[PDB]
Write a protein that binds this ligand. Sequence first.
Ligand SMILES: O=C1Nc2ccccc2/C1=C/Nc1ccc(S(=O)(=O)Nc2nccs2)cc1
Length: 282
Amino acid sequence: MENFQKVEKIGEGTYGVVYKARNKLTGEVVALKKIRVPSTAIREISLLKELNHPNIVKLLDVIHTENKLYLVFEFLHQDLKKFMDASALTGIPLPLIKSYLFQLLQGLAFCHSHRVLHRDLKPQNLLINTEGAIKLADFGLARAFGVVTLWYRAPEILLGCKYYSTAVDIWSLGCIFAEMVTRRALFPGDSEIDQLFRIFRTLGTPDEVVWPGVTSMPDYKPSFPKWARQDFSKVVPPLDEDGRSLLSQMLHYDPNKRISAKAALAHPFFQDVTKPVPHLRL
Ligand SMILES: O=C1Nc2ccccc2/C1=C/Nc1ccc(S(=O)(=O)Nc2nccs2)cc1
């Protein structure tokens, strides 16, 4: 703890405050996350330290001192939320959107193959650098432990399913995909019920035909209004057919029919993917 010099505060995450800090010893700049400890969490976190991938923010060290928990992560200078705000006037170039989505799916495919889920994907958790790379941050912390944005929450979570799967991360990514394309949140709910209804009004109220078992979900109510499904060409206008085709498979109601990160990587949308370098103003 005293081995780190705080330079600035990067924001208060869900599991604690994040700071940009300098390691007195090394001199390296890192992201210091103060949490707030059960042994279950300690072991869980320990496993994440082994999860190494170019599109995953590396967990450098875990400091459990004086019954306090500090996580040291590699540091990246900007998150996707800030990059989108800075590009609000012209939008993010399609080649760059395609590159970012491709890398994010590689990262998720790696995590999901290790049975590790993010559970809380959102623009703020996606970090970028000057080299054109993008990385997933805060991966696996939801399980290690336990106004919040509900905008990217999968339908099965909102309906009370307590044993969610890797599919919830694909749903969140799909929502982010749509947001980069249109420059506007896809389902900006301001409460759990409002979130669910915004999804229903766009994708249509789900039934047993499209989502077997949906009516047996814990929070499902027969009294839910029935809205018709809206056409995708209206939802994410500029996106070509390859893109809309991919997006639709990422947003399937039934978690079991929703596309995996692995299968999405082979989708025709990525046939012409490249790695452009973004103009970043740090
Ligand atoms: O670099 C980081 N590694 C992490 C691991 C887990 C959780 C968070 C992080 C993390 C955060 N970095 C970061 C750096 C800059 C910005 S920003 O430029 O978009 N906004 C701010 N800049 C200064 C203060 S707030 C946002 C996130």
